[PDB]
Write a protein that holds these residues in place. Structure first.
Motif, PDB file in Angstrom:
ATOM      1  N   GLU A 197       0.742  -1.385   0.051  1.00 32.09           N
ATOM      2  CA  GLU A 197       0.105   0.086   0.042  1.00 32.09           C
ATOM      3  C   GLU A 197       0.828   1.349   0.108  1.00 32.09           C
ATOM      4  N   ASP A 198       1.922   1.304   0.917  1.00 30.51           N
ATOM      5  CA  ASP A 198       2.841   2.442   0.760  1.00 30.51           C
ATOM      6  C   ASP A 198       3.590   2.524  -0.257  1.00 30.51           C
ATOM      7  N   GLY A 199       4.082   1.266  -1.013  1.00 35.26           N
ATOM      8  CA  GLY A 199       4.858   1.370  -2.140  1.00 35.26           C
ATOM      9  C   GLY A 199       6.075   0.853  -1.574  1.00 35.26           C
ATOM     10  N   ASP A 200       6.635  -0.305  -1.718  1.00 37.93           N
ATOM     11  CA  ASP A 200       7.754  -0.774  -1.703  1.00 37.93           C
ATOM     12  C   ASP A 200       7.647  -2.338  -1.988  1.00 37.93           C
ATOM     13  N   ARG A 201       8.793  -2.964  -2.386  1.00 39.53           N
ATOM     14  CA  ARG A 201       8.885  -4.244  -2.820  1.00 39.53           C
ATOM     15  C   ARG A 201       8.584  -5.272  -1.653  1.00 39.53           C
ATOM     16  N   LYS A 202       7.468  -5.994  -1.728  1.00 36.36           N
ATOM     17  CA  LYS A 202       6.910  -7.103  -0.720  1.00 36.36           C
ATOM     18  C   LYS A 202       7.592  -8.211  -1.190  1.00 36.36           C
ATOM     19  N   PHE A 203       7.380  -9.327  -0.353  1.00 35.78           N
ATOM     20  CA  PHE A 203       7.581 -10.570  -0.597  1.00 35.78           C
ATOM     21  C   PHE A 203       9.271 -10.692  -1.129  1.00 35.78           C
ATOM     22  N   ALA A 204      10.151 -10.167  -0.105  1.00 32.76           N
ATOM     23  CA  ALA A 204      11.544 -10.110  -0.379  1.00 32.76           C
ATOM     24  C   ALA A 204      12.292 -11.171   0.454  1.00 32.76           C
ATOM     25  N   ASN A 205      13.647 -11.674   0.020  1.00 33.26           N
ATOM     26  CA  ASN A 205      14.399 -12.713   0.530  1.00 33.26           C
ATOM     27  C   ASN A 205      15.238 -12.237   1.526  1.00 33.26           C
ATOM     28  N   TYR A 206      15.651 -12.997   2.433  1.00 36.16           N
ATOM     29  CA  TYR A 206      16.670 -12.794   3.491  1.00 36.16           C
ATOM     30  C   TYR A 206      17.259 -14.002   3.838  1.00 36.16           C
ATOM     31  N   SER A 207      18.836 -13.821   3.787  1.00 38.86           N
ATOM     32  CA  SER A 207      19.691 -14.830   4.170  1.00 38.86           C
ATOM     33  C   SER A 207      20.410 -14.776   5.583  1.00 38.86           C
TER      34      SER A 207
END
Ligand SMILES: *[C@@H]1O[C@H](CO)[C@@H](O[C@@H]2O[C@H](CO)[C@@H](O[C@@H]3O[C@H](CO)[C@@H](O)[C@H](O)[C@@H]3O)[C@H](O)[C@H]2NC(C)=O)[C@H](O)[C@H]1NC(C)=O
Ligand SMILES: *[C@@H]1O[C@H](CO)[C@@H](O[C@@H]2O[C@H](CO)[C@@H](O)[C@H](O)[C@H]2NC(C)=O)[C@H](O)[C@H]1NC(C)=O
Ligand SMILES: CC(=O)N[C@@H]1[C@@H](O)[C@H](O)[C@@H](CO)O[C@H]1O
Ligand SMILES: *[C@@H]1O[C@H](CO)[C@@H](O)[C@H](O)[C@H]1NC(C)=O
Ligand SMILES: *[C@@H]1O[C@H](CO)[C@@H](O)[C@H](O)[C@H]1NC(C)=O
Ligand SMILES: *[C@@H]1O[C@H](CO)[C@@H](O)[C@H](O)[C@H]1NC(C)=O
Ligand SMILES: *[C@@H]1O[C@H](CO)[C@@H](O)[C@H](O)[C@H]1NC(C)=O
Lengths: 379, 375
Positions: free
Chosen positions: B318-328
Motif C-alpha cells: 500500500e505504501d509502495g515498496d517491494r514486498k515478499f523479499a528474500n533474507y539470508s
C-alpha cells in the motif's frame, strides 16, 4: 541584512515599489535595509535559480517568503535550499503554511503555522461546549490522512467525555471515481455532527454529493480543519452555510502588514543576540560552491531565534518548526456567504459569541425550537 | 507514438547497460503501436547542481518515469533526494532501486516514490519470526534516536501487541555518541539475556567495544543485529556468533535495472489502453501546472504484477515498496560470515549447519535467568 521574496501576485507592484526605499521603515534596533527580489511563474527551475543568485552577493542574513495558496509542492523546495546554504528562512503565506512534520536534520525552515493536532484540540473544545458528543469522521485517501486519523483517537482518550463516535468512512473523491459506491456509503449514515478532512478539490466534490444525499439541511453541521477552506475570502458554491474551521490569528490582514511582522522576528532575534553574546552573528550563505560541511556558529544563533515576543504576542517555536500556543480564532459561514469571527482561543480557555448555534434553513429564515428556553437568575 | 523515459545512473558502462535492456524489452512484446527511448545523466557533487541538471534532462524529453541509483555513497542519504523534490513537483513517477532509508516511505513529504527493495524498517519482521520458532520471550531492545531507528521501534511494537507480549526495556541513545557504558550498565541487572541492536555502522562499532569491558559478549548471552550492523568498520570489532542477516541480491545494481524496465514497460502498455492520456509538460521553466494524469499513472503502476523477475517476484504494498523479499541469515564464526539459513517471504527454513552461539556452546541458550536476589 534581510531579503524579501515575492512568489505570487496579481500585480501589487505599487506595494512592491513601496518596499524598495524604506530602509528606515521599522523601529526595530538593527540595520534593516531590505533588498527585494521578484519571481514570475514559480517553479523548481525559477525558484532555485534566483534564490542563491541573490544569495551569491550582499551576504544576506535571512529570507522571508510569501506566495499564493493551492500550491503544496513548494513547501519542500524551500526546506531543501535551507539544508545546503545554511541560512535561516521564514515563510509567511498561505502556500507553505501547511506544516511538514519531518524536517531535514540540519534545516532551519521555521514555518509559521499550526500543526494538524493543535487544530483538532480547539475543535473538540467547541464540540464539547455545546455537548454534541456524537460524530462521524470522513476522510479521503489524501497523503497524511493516517496521521490525522490517529489525532482523533488519541485526543478522544485524553479527555473526560463519553465521546461516542459512530463510524469512520473512507472514499476516493478525485475527478474520477464511482459515485454510486460513495453514494452507498454516504446515504447509509446517521449522525448529528460530522468532522471531515479533505483538500479543496475534494471538498467541492464531497459537498456536491452531500446535498444529493440530504446531508446539508439544518439537521446537521460540519467541521473541517484549516486545509479544506478556500483562499480566505471567496468561498465557492456548494459550501454549506454554517461551516466551521479554525484559523490562526492573522486570518484577516494586509500582505504589507505580514511582512513587517516577518522582518520583526529576524530583527528582534538579531538584536537580542548582540546583548547576550555580542556583535551581529556572522551573516554568510553560499550556493553550490562548497556548501555547508558543518555549522558550529550559526547553529548557536538558531536557538536565540526561537523565542521572541513583539507587540504583545508570543511567537515561541518548537523544534518541529511550527508555532506553539498561538492565539487561534474560529470562523463560520453566515447567511451572506462570508466569514465571521465567532470565538477566540486565548491562554488555554475557549471563548464564544453565540450561546447557542443559530441553525439555518433551506432559505435563510432562522429555525428556532419550542423546547428550549432562556433562564435568568442571581446569586 | 513515441514514449520517452529517462534515468540517472552512476557509471557510463551502466548507462549503456541500461540502454541494452530497454532494447530487449522493446523486442519482447513491442509492436508498431508505441515505441520507447532512454536517456541518462550522471551524478555531481553539489546536489543543487544535480537538481538543475535533473530538469535539463526533463526539457530534453517528454519524461514518463525516472530511475536513480547511488553506487558511490559519500552520503548514502542525500544522494537520491534532489531528484524526488524536482520530479515530485510535476507528479512524475520516480523509481528508486538502491536506497534503504526509511524516510522516503512517508508519502506526505515525497508525493511520488517507489522501490524495488524493502527498507530497513521491514527488517524486524524476520526478527519476530525467529522469536516464535526458537521460543524466545524476553528481549532487550537497543535503538538509536534518529528517524532511521525510531521506525524500527514502532514496527516491532505493533507486531508484538497483536499477541500481547509487551517487550521490555527499550533503550535509546544519541547517535554519534561515545561512552555508552553509562547506558549498558542499566541493562546489566535486567532478567532478559537476548539483545536486539539497530544502529549505524559508526555507532555499532562503539557499542561492540563498550561491551568488551562489561563481559556482555560472554557465554549465555545471545546477540542478533541488522544488515548495516555487520557491514563496515564495525565487523572487525564484532564478537563471534552474532546471528546477523543480509539481503539476497542487494547492491547488485545490474539485475534491478532489468526488473525496473520490465515492470515499467508492462505499465505503460496497460495504461495507454485507455482514454485521455495527455503527456507531461515540456520544460522546467515556463510552466506551473502539474501533469493532469500523474496520479493515474502511479495508481495503475502500484498493482502491476511481474513474473519473470531476475530477483524474483516483484510486487508493491500500500505504501509502495517491494514486498515478499528474500533474507539470508548469517553467523560469525572465526571472523568469517557463514550462511545458516534462508528467509523466504513468511517463514524461515534453516538446515545444513550447526549454529555457533557466542559463548562457544552447542546447545540453544535460553534467556530469562530468574534473579534470586530481590530489591
Ligand atoms: C530518443 O533518444 C535519443 C537519445 O537520447 C534522443 O536524442 C537526444 O536528443 C537530445 C535533445 O536534443 C540531445 O540533447 C542535446 O545534446 C547536446 C550534445 O552536446 C547537448 O549539448 C544539448 O544541451 C542537449 O542536451 C541528445 O544529445 C540526443 N542524444 C544523442 C545520443 O545525441 C532523441 O531525441 C529521442 N527521441 C524521441 C522521439 O524520444
Ligand atoms: C530568549 O531568546 C534569547 C535570544 O538568543 C535567548 O538567549 C540565549 O540564552 C541562553 C541562556 O543561557 C544561552 O545559552 C543561549 O546561547 C542564548 N542564545 C544565543 C547566545 O544565541 C534566551 O535564552 C531565550 N529565553 C529567555 C528566557 O530569554
Ligand atoms: C519456497 C518456500 O520455502 N516457500 C515458503 C514455504 O516453504 C512456506 O511453507 C510458506 C508459508 O509457511 O511460505 C512460502
Ligand atoms: C566515560 O568513560 C569512562 C571510562 O574511562 C567511564 O569511567 C565513565 O563512567 C564514562 N562516563 C559515564 C557518564 O558513564
Ligand atoms: C567482568 O567485568 C569485571 C568488572 O566489570 C572484570 O573485573 C572482570 O575481569 C570481567 N570478567 C572477565 C572474565 O574478564
Ligand atoms: C548481478 O546480478 C546479475 C543477474 O542476477 C548476475 O548475473 C551478476 O553476476 C550479479 N553481479 C554483478 C556484479 O553483476
Ligand atoms: C528467493 O525466494 C524465492 C521464493 O520462494 C525462492 O524460491 C528462491 O529460491 C529464493 N532465492 C533466490 C531466488 O535466490
Amino acid at each position: 541584512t534581510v531579503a524579501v521574496v515575492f512568489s505570487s501576485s496579481g500585480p501589487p507592484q505599487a506595494q512592491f515599489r513601496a518596499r524598495l526605499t524604506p530602509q528606515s521603515f521599522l523601529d526595530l534596533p538593527l540595520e534593516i535595509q531590505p533588498l527585494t527580489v521578484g519571481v514570475n511563474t514559480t517553479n523548481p527551475s525559477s525558484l532555485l535559480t534566483q534564490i542563491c543568485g541573490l544569495l551569491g552577493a550582499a551576504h544576506v542574513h535571512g529570507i522571508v517568503f510569501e506566495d499564493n495558496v493551492d500550491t503544496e509542492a513548494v513547501a519542500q523546495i524551500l526546506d531543501f535550499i535551507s539544508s545546503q546554504t545554511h541560512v535561516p528562512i521564514l515563510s509567511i503565506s498561505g502556500g507553505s503554511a501547511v506544516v511538514l512534520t519531518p524536517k531535514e536534520p540540519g534545516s532551519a525552515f521555521l514555518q509559521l503555522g499550526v500543526s494538524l493536532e493543535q487544530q483538532l484540540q480547539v475543535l473538540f473544545k467547541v464540540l464539547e461546549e455545546y455537548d454534541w458528543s456524537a460524530f462521524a469522521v470522513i476522510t479521503s485517501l489524501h497523503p497524511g490522512h493516517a496521521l490525522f486519523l490517529e489525532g482523533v483517537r488519541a485526543v478522544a482518550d485524553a479527555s473526560h467525555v463519553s465521546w461516542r463516535l459512530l463510524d469512520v468512512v473512507t472514499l476516493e473523491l478525485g475527478p474520477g471515481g464511482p459515485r454510486a459506491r460513495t453514494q452507498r456509503l454516504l446515504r447509509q449514515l446517521d449522525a448529528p455532527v460530522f468532522v471531515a478532512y479533505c483538500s479543496r478539490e475534494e471538498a467541492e466534490v464531497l459537498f456536491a454529493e452531500a446535498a444529493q444525499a440530504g446531508l446539508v439541511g439544518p439537521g446537521h453541521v460540519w467541521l473541517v480543519p484549516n486545509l479544506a477552506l478556500g483562499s480566505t475570502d471567496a468561498p465557492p458554491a456548494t459550501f454549506p452555510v454554517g461551516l466551521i474551521s479554525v484559523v490562526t490569528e492573522s486570518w484577516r490582514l494586509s500582505l504589507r502588514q505580514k511582512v513587517r511582522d516577518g522582518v520583526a522576528i529576524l530583527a528582534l532575534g538579531a538584536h537580542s543576540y548582540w546583548r547576550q553574546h555580542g556583535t551581529l552573528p556572522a551573516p554568510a550563505g553560499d550556493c553550490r560552491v562548497h556548501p555547508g560541511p558543518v555549522s558550529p556558529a550559526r547553529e548557536a544563533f538558531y536557538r536565540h531565534l526561537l523565542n521572541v515576543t513583539w507587540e504583545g504576542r508570543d511567537f515561541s517555536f518548537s523544534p518541529g518548526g511550527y508555532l506553539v500556543q498561538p492565539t487561534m480564532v474560529v470562523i463560520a459561514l453566515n447567511r451572506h456567504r462570508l466569514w465571521e469571527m465567532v470565538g477566540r482561543w486565548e491562554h488555554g480557555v475557549l471563548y464564544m459569541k453565540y450561546p447557542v448555534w443559530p441553525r439555518y434553513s433551506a432559505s435563510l429564515q432562522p429555525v428556532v425550537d419550542s423546547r428550549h428556553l432562556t433562564v435568568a437568575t442571581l446569586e | 507514438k513515441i514514449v520517452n523515459i529517462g534515468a540517472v545512473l552512476s557509471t557510463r558502462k551502466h548507462e549503456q547497460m541500461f540502454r541494452e535492456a530497454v532494447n530487449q524489452a522493446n523486442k519482447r512484446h513491442g509492436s508498431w503501436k508505441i515505441q520507447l527511448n532512454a536517456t541518462s545523466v550522471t551524478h555531481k557533487p553539489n546536489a543543487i547542481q544535480m537538481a538543475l541538471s535533473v530538469c535539463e534532462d526533463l526539457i530534453s524529453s517528454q519524461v514518463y518515469a525516472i530511475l536513480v541509483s547511488h553506487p558511490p555513497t559519500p552520503n548514502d542519504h542525500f544522494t537520491p533526494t534532489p531528484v524526488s523534490y524536482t520530479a515530485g513537483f510535476y507528479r512524475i513517477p520516480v523509481l528508486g532501486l538502491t536506497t534503504r532509508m526509511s524516510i522516503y516511505s512517508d508519502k506526505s513529504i515525497h508525493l511520488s516514490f517507489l522501490r524495488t527493495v524493502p527498507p530497513y524498517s521491514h527488517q524486524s519482521s524476520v526478527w519476530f519470526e525467529m522469536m516464535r520458532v526458537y521460543s524466545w520471550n524476553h528481549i532487550i531492545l537497543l535503538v538509536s534516536d534518529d528517524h532511521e531507528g525510531r521506525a524500527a521501534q514502532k514496527r516491532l511494537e505493533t507486531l508484538l501487541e497483536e499477541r500481547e507480549s509487551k517487550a521490555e526495556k527499550v533503550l535509546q541513545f544519541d547517535p554519534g555518541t561515545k561512552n555508552v557504558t553509562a547506558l549498558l550498565m542499566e541493562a546489566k541487572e535486567l532478567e532478559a539475556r537476548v539483545i536486539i541492536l539497530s544502529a549505524s555502522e559508526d555507532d555499532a562499532a562503539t557499542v561492540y567495544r563498550a561491551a568488551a569491558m562489561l563481559n556482555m559478549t560472554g557465554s549465555g548471552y545471545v546477540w542478533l543485529v541488522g544488515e548495516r550492523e555487520i557491514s563496515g568498520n564495525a565487523l572487525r570489532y564484532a564478537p563471534d556468533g552474532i546471528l546477523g542477516l543480509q539481503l539476497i541480491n542487494g547492491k547488485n545494481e545490474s539485475a534491478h535495472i532489468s526488473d525496473a524496465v520490465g515492470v515499467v514497460a508492462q505499465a505503460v502498455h496497460e495504461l495507454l489502453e485507455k482514454e485521455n492520456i495527455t503527456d507531461p509538460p515540456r520544460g522546467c521553466v515556463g510552466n506551473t501546472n502539474i501533469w493532469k494524469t500523474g496520479p493515474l499513472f502511479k495508481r495503475v503502476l502500484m498493482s502491476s504484477k511481474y513474473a519473470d523477475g531476475v530477483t524474483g517476484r516483484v510486487e508493491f504494498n500500500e505504501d509502495g515498496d517491494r514486498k515478499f523479499a528474500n533474507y539470508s541469515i548469517m553467523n560469525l564464526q572465526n571472523r568469517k560470515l557463514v550462511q545458516v539459513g534462508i528467509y523466504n517471504g513468511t517463514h524461515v527454513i534453516p538446515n545444513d549447519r550447526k549454529i555457533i552461539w557466542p559463548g562457544g556452546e552447542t546447545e540453544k541458550p535460553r534467556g530469562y535467568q530468574m534473579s534470586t536476589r530481590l530489591k
